[PDB]
Symmetry: C3
Subunit: 183 residues, 3 copies
C-alpha cells in the first residue's frame, strides 16, 4: 500500500484524442509526507501519435487529467482509465479496486483549489522529456495540482512543444518529481 | 528519524527575511528516505527589493541568497534567513508542539559535502535546478543549492536564486523543484 | 539494507579510459517500488581529466556502465570497481560483499532488454550537470536502463557536451533521478 501505479506494461490505458490511444506510465510512491512520482507517455494512435507541424501547424500541446474524489478514488471523467489504476502487487495490481488513497493526494493547503485568493505558482512543476529518446527532441511536461473543478483533488499533465517536428512519434523518456501529500 | 518530515508548514504566511524583515515565504519540505533526504522547495517574495523585478530600470538586480544554518544537533540557528518559529517536524498541516532538539539524520553528509578548508573544493556539494516565475514557461530562474559551505555552523543548506533574462515588472513567486542529498546519518 | 552506494569519499573507484581514472559517487536508496538515485563524477587523471576541444575537437562524450547478474551483483566488466560497491554501513561499506540486491535492479517489464520488439524511450532519463559548479559549463548525463548485453540488468551513464571547452576539469555537480524497481 506504499505504491499506487498504472502497472509498468505498455497496454494502452489513456484517452487523449480517442479511446485508449496511449499508455501513461505513472508510479506514485509514498515516502511519508511526500509522494515520489515517476512518469512517461507512449502515444500509439490518433491525432497525437505522429506529430507533423508542417502538415498540422496548430497541433502543439495536449492535456491528461487525473481527477479524484474525497477518498482519493479516480473519477471516470479522467483521461486515465480506472481499470488498471490501483495499488501494486508484483508487476500487476491488487485484485480488488481500492476505496481509500487520501495519503497519495496532493495537499490542499500547499495546492488550493481556485478561489478569489491570490493564485500562487507553487502548485506547478515543470520538466522536459525527450521524444524517441533523442536529445534534440524536447517537449515540456507541466504538472499542476488541484486546479481542476468537479473534484476534491486533481493531477494534470500538460505536454507541449515549440519546435516544428516533422513525423516525430510522441513517446517519451521518463521524468521524476515530488509533491506534498494531503496526509 | 526514519521516515519523518521536517518542514516550514505549507501555508503562505511569510517566514523568511531576504532584504527586509519577513519579505518572503520559503516553502521547504525535507523527508527522510533512509540515507537520502528528498527535498521539495518553492519561494514567494511578498515585499521589498526582490518582490517585483525590473531589469530595464535596474539591470544589475540579478540574484539573491537564502541561508539555513544548523548546529551539531541539526537545530536551525536564529541568524538563518528562515525563521525558527515554524521550522519543525510535521504534525498535520502544522508542526509538533515541541521545538525539535535532534535532526542529524536530516543534515547534509559532511564527508560527501565537507566544510570549506584548504583542500580542493569539489562541485558535488551543488545541485542546480530551474524554476519558473508566475508559472510562466518563458520566465525561468536558476535555483542553485549548496551544502555545508557556510561558516558559524556544523551544517548548512544555501539557496541562491538568479536569472539571466531582462524581466520587466515580474513578481518573484515560483514553481516547485525537487532534489535529494546524502544524509549525515 | 536500504542503500547501495560507493562511499562518498574522493578515492578513485572507476575506470573510464585508464585504471582508476575516476571517482563515481552513486547512492541508490530503496523507497519500495522506486529507487531514489543520486549521482556525481570526479575524473582525476587520463584522457577525460582536463577537456580541451581546441586540442581534441572530437573528445565530446564517454560512458560508465554498471552491469549486474540475476542476483543484482556487480559484474567485473563494469567501469565501477567491485570492491567499492556495497550496502551502506556508517560512512563506509560492510566488510563482506553482498549476495542479493534484486530489489535495487531496474524493472525488466518497465525497461526490457533489446529484442526485435519496438524499443521505447521510457528506459532513458535525461539530466544536465555542471562542470566545476559553473552555470555556463553544462554537460548532459543520459542514464539508460537494461540496454547492455552480457548481463541480466544494467545502468549506464553517458556523459556528453556540445560546447567547445578549453582546459575544463571534468568534475560535476550532483543529479537526482528515480526508476521503477524489479521487486
Ligand atoms: C538534456 C539534453 C538537452 O539539454 N537537450 C537540449 C539540446 C541539446 O543540448 C543539443 O541538441 C545537443 O545534444 O539542445 C536544444 O536546444 C535542442 O532543441 O536541440 C534543447 C534541448 O533541451
Ligand atoms: C520547462 C519549460 C522550458 O523549458 N522553458 C524554456 C522556454 C520555453 O521552451 C519556450 O519559451 C517555449 O515555451 O524557453 C526559454 O528559452 C525561455 O526563456 O523562453 C528557456 C526556458 O527554460
Ligand atoms: C541551471 C543553470 C543553467 O540553466 N545554465 C545554462 C546557462 C545559464 O542559463 C547562463 O550561462 C546564465 O547563467 O546557459 C547555457 O546556454 C550556457 O551554456 O551557458 C546553458 C546552461 O544549461
Ligand atoms: Zn507508434
Ligand atoms: Zn506580490
Ligand atoms: Zn588536474
Amino acid at each position: 500500500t506504499r505504491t499506487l501505479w498504472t502497472t509498468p506494461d505498455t497496454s494502452p490505458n489513456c484517452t487523449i484524442a480517442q479511446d485508449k490511444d496511449s499508455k501513461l506510465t505513472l508510479v506514485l510512491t509514498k515516502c511519508g509526507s511526500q509522494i515520489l512520482a515517476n512518469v512517461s507517455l507512449i502515444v500509439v494512435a490518433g491525432k497525437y501519435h505522429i506529430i507533423n507541424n508542417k502538415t498540422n501547424p496548430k497541433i502543439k500541446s495536449f492535456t491528461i487529467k487525473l481527477l479524484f474524489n474525497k477518498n482519493g478514488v479516480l473519477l471516470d471523467n479522467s483521461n486515465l482509465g480506472k481499470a488498471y489504476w490501483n495499488f501494486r502487487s508484483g508487476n500487476s495490481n491488487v485484485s480488488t479496486a481500492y476505496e481509500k488513497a487520501i495519503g497519495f493526494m496532493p495537499n490542499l493547503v500547499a495546492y488550493p483549489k481556485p478561489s478569489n485568493s491570490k493564485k500562487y505558482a507553487r502548485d506547478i512543476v515543470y520538466g522536459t522529456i525527450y521524444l524517441g529518446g533523442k536529445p534534440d527532441q524536447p517537449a515540456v511536461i507541466k504538472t499542476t495540482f488541484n486546479q481542476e473543478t468537479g473534484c476534491e483533488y486533481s493531477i494534470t499533465f500538460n505536454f507541449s512543444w515549440s519546435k516544428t517536428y516533422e513525423n516525430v512519434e510522441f513517446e517519451t523518456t521518463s521524468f521524476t518529481f515530488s509533491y506534498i501529500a494531503q496526509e
